[PDB]
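Work package 3, deliverable 3.1, input record:
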Amino acid sequence: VDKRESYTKEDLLASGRGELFGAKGPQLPAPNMLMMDRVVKMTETGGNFDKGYVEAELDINPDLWFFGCHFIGDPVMPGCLGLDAMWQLVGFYLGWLGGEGKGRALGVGEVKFTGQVLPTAKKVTYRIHFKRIVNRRLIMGLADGEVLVDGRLIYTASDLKVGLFQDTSAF
Amino acid sequence: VDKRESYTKEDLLASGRGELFGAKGPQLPAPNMLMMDRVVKMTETGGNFDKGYVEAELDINPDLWFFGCHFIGDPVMPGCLGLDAMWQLVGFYLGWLGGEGKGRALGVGEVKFTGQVLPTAKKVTYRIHFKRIVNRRLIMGLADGEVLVDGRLIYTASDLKVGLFQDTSAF
């Protein structure tokens, strides 16, 4: 895969279609499960553990689908979706490294939500710090993640774990 | 509130509008974020810790929205949504006990996905085992959860934490 340092909305839409990393690489979900608008920085070193880093962003506007149903009369972005954006990124990175197989979130250690994303926010930032990568014949990625809303750290997640599966029926 | 041990799809939809437990109580998300069709059993005792139990179900069909976008050509229910259903149920139980305020998931201890829900499955079962409730000036619920697909355990979550906030400015 020709690694780029950044990807645009159109690159992420292609990803979901299987065009970015090709037919044997992982895919990101398509709207409305896609939780990022852009990947601004990807590096194989750096990050808190110096073993990789990814930063992505989601632009907030009052019309985003999830605000209307969550909750009626009390709009707030579901923390589960911000968490999913982090699993989505770990899987995207494994494919960026050239890993083959479809992505599947395997788990996460501690997750703490200390604030919320309201429809008046402007931007959500996702920062992923890779701890361990097993790109052997068993691709797995381990990482810590952070979610910031307009620069304020609101969610942390330790040990996000994602694996790539050549044959998904074995899951 | 008048406690019942089971609720229908209709009750759950009324809950999305605050019409089940009243305006002062918490709400469940409305479609498409509502992740269960019915609550089959709720008890104040029972469960693995004899401190509360909740069993709910989600009927599966190939047409559920999330199969189409997650992923294209590889339909699988997002584990993040199964996880959210567990947070939704803890908040619902807190309201059922007569709690007042809006629900906000505060976190989870450890999550493990060891299986997946495909469009060929028929039913997802959620089991929540309460371990501690704080229904004072501070209302929080701590529980362990399990997700089963067609009777087989696929996800587990320890220490799901949810709080009811009277003033969401405290977040």
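Chain A touches chain B through 44 residues (CB under 8 Å).
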